[PDB]
Ligand binder design. Structure first.
Ligand SMILES: OC[C@@]1(O)OC[C@@H](O)[C@@H](O)[C@@H]1O
Ligand SMILES: OC[C@@]1(O)OC[C@@H](O)[C@@H](O)[C@@H]1O
Ligand SMILES: OC[C@@]1(O)OC[C@@H](O)[C@@H](O)[C@@H]1O
Ligand SMILES: OC[C@@]1(O)OC[C@@H](O)[C@@H](O)[C@@H]1O
Ligand SMILES: OC[C@@]1(O)OC[C@@H](O)[C@@H](O)[C@@H]1O
Ligand SMILES: OC[C@@]1(O)OC[C@@H](O)[C@@H](O)[C@@H]1O
Lengths: 88, 88, 88
């Protein structure tokens, strides 16, 4: 079936749910006012996520795997970019 | 194989481990006094979870996927209920 | 494809990413100074993880599943050991 990963922060809370479906990962967001589709959309058959706070900023890392290749995607306040993670 | 998701809170800690096995998700709980089977039992081939605290209350969200349908299950102090999440 | 699980702590942060690949789980670590391969290497087709702090100590629980058997692996400051978790 489809495969999901979830993270949350604060007391509202904000929630992010990533779904790997048919080889692509999309993102659903809850910030207390209804679910909506987030900016993240990248290839992947499997997804995991972790997030942390630094002061009042959220940092998200999404690990997207297709075949034996895992790409780390980073949210640090200004869009998603590929991170330095490799599996080695 | 079977597929799991885990979350934890506090310093004991409390741990919840969800296992999707043969199309159903069950829940194992640790609160410092041995593992036991929790109340959660719902359909699902894949599971993810996140949890947060608000004061001294735990909130748990379990994302249960069967086929292309993902159901959010909510624990907010008084049993499990379906939440508003949709994948769209 | 391969399957991952991720956790993080602190503000650096420290990140641990577990990958189940070809029936074994390995561990990649980030502590602010580059990714490296961690000590964890055990059988598993599926992996989940949770971690918590107690004061200034990290506790990690990795749930490694092969077939219908799930083994809990514990990091509590001094190597990985099997924990008491069972699925029942
Ligand atoms: O719109 C909300 C948003 O900016 O929140 C942070 C990330 O989850 C983004 O992908 C998402 O679009
Ligand atoms: O700022 C981005 C970055 O340095 O954040 C920490 C890790 O996720 C790294 O792989 C990643 O490149
Ligand atoms: O008995 C412990 C319990 O109430 O803890 C909160 C939830 O994890 C429930 O499913 C579970 O049964
Ligand atoms: O109180 C339940 C609820 O509002 O909690 C926040 C989100 O998990 C929603 O989908 C869900 O319906
Ligand atoms: O070297 C860093 C390390 O000790 O950090 C704690 C655990 O993640 C270990 O498996 C890992 O080797
Ligand atoms: O100290 C190890 C241990 O007691 O930690 C809490 C749970 O993870 C248990 O299954 C595990 O045996």
């Amino acid at each position: 079936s489809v495969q999901t990963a979830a993270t949350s922060w604060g007391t509202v809370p904000s929630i992010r749910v990533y779904t790997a479906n048919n080889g692509r990962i999309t993102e659903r967001c809850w910030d207390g006012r209804g679910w909506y589709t987030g900016a993240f959309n990248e290839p992947g058959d499997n997804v995991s996520v972790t997030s942390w706070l630094v002061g009042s900023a959220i940092h998200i890392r999404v690990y997207a795997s297709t075949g034996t290749t895992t790409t780390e995607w980073c949210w640090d306040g200004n869009g998603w970019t590929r991170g330095a993670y490799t599996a080695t």
